[PDB]
Amino acid sequence: GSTLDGPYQPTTFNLPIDYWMLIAPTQIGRVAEGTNTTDRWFACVLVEPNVQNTQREYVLDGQTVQLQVSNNSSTLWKFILFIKLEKNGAYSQYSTLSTSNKLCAWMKREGRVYWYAGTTPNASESYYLTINNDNSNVSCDAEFYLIPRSQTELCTQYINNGL
Ligand SMILES: CC(=O)N[C@H]1[C@@H](O[C@H]2[C@@H](O)[C@@H](CO)O[C@H](O)[C@@H]2O[C@@H]2O[C@@H](C)[C@@H](O)[C@@H](O)[C@@H]2O)O[C@H](CO)[C@H](O)[C@@H]1O
Numbered sequence: 329g330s331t332l333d334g335p336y337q338p339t340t341f342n343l344p345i346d347y348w349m350l351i352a353p354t355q356i357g358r359v360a361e362g363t364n365t366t367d368r369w370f371a372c373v374l375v376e377p378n379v380q381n382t383q384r385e386y387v388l389d390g391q392t393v394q395l396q397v398s399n400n401s402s403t404l405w406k407f408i409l410f411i412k413l414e415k416n417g418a419y420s421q422y423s424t425l426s427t428s429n430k431l432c433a434w435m436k437r438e439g440r441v442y443w444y445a446g447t448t449p450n451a452s453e454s455y456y457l458t459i460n461n462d463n464s465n466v467s468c469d470a471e472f473y474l475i476p477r478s479q480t481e482l483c484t485q486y487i488n489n490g491l
Pocket residue numbers: 411422454455456457458459
């Protein structure tokens with residue numbers, strides 16, 4: 329089988345730059361979040377297949393918020409990437425990953441957070457947000473793995489085909 333660095337237990341830590349954090353939730357709902365503490369608070373949530381347009385509650389940056397979500401796929405899971413731009417602001421939707429594999433991944437590099445988006449088996453690191461803070465903490469509700477940038481091809485393989 330594939331050999332990855334992990335699984336690590338859910339935690340909050342200063343994710344080092346140039347590593348994919350491949351997150352592997354077992355449950356729907358909040359999966360992970362992070363912030364530069366100044367102008368980006370980002371979060372991903374997992375939605376099961378066959379979910380009509382609805383409002384669900386998530387606890388993001390410690391606060392209970394209602395967010396509009398949907399997943400019209402009969403078979404694919406969906407990660408949704410939400411971001412708020414100021415401490416007291418509301419989250420907007422920026423990207424999604426529709427997947428048969430239930431894995432998502434992000435990396436801190438070049439002052440950005442890169443994120444795998446699209447639909448498996450053709451998801452790719454096509455989305456990013458700007459954080460300009462290499463010491464931005466991430467918190468995770470799921471087990472996760474770390475993959476060096478030199479193995480981006482493997483991260484892409486895992487996102488799209490599973491471990
Ligand atoms: C939420 C956030 O932090 N956005 C950054 C980010 O914005 C980029 C980025 O999301 C890429 C990902 O593929 O898509 C765009 O390029 C986006 O830029 C924004 O949209 C485009 C079309 C332009 O109008 C651009 O001016 C705009 O910023 O990176 C940029 C810098 O490259 C900003 O830092 C955003 O705030």
